[PDB]
């Protein structure tokens, strides 16, 4: 949802929602930094 509204043209997602995604993906999901790099590549590949 958040990567879909704050999307601009698709995969171009800025750096405030990467780490806002992190504290919710660290809070709701409890994830790291580098596994988070893989899940953000999957999030922009899905968002692509």
């Amino acid at each position: 949802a958040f990567g879909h509204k704050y999307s601009e043209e698709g995969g171009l997602i800025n750096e405030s929602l990467r780490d806002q995604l992190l504290v919710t993906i660290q809070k709701t999901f409890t994830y790291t930094r580098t596994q988070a790099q893989h899940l953000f590549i999957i999030l922009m590949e899905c968002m692509k």
Binding site: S16, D19, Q20, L22, V23, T24, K27
Partner: peptide, 22 residues
Amino acid sequence: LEEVNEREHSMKASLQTVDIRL
């Protein structure tokens, strides 16, 4: 009330990011 809800959602996300900044 709908304005208050959307704005409070934005404020809560900013507060969680502020906690991340600490």
